[PDB]
């Protein structure tokens, strides 16, 4: 056997029982952007790649066990 992890990156966001969230909310809360739109992590994250979406809107209609991806920041969400 030769395959050990390092620090372990279990990036998992919570949603609960809401209609959905904005790329800024998911990100900001998850700890992506300190402000939400400073490094353009909002609009960007969109245009990057989302679990089922390849767009770049201001708000996103996603819920449950879905993932979001931006540049190098990849995290999943549950609801």
Curated annotation (Swiss-Prot):
Family annotation (SUPFAM superfamilies): Alpha-L RNA-binding motif (SSF55174)
Gene3D superfamilies membership: RNA-binding S4 domain (3.10.290.10)
Domain S4 RNA-binding residue range list: 21-77
Any one GO biological process: translation
GO cellular component: cytosol
GO terms for MF: RNA binding
Keywords: RNA-binding
Role of this protein: Its structure and the presence of conserved basic residues indicates that it probably binds RNA.
UniProt subunit comment: In pull-down experiments interacts with CedA.
Descriptive protein name: Putative RNA-binding protein YbcJ
Organism: Escherichia coli (strain K12)
Source species taxonomy: Bacteria, Pseudomonadati, Pseudomonadota, Gammaproteobacteria, Enterobacterales
């Amino acid at each position: 056997g030769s395959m050990i992890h390092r620090m372990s990156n279990m990036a998992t966001f919570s949603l609960g029982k809401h209609p959905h969230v904005e790329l800024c909310d998911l990100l900001k809360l998850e700890g992506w952007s300190e402000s939400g739109a400073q490094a353009k992590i909002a609009i960007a994250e969109g245009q990057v790649k989302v679990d089922g979406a390849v767009e770049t809107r201001k708000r996103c209609k996603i819920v449950a066990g879905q993932t979001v991806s931006f540049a190098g920041h990849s995290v999943q969400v549950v609801a």
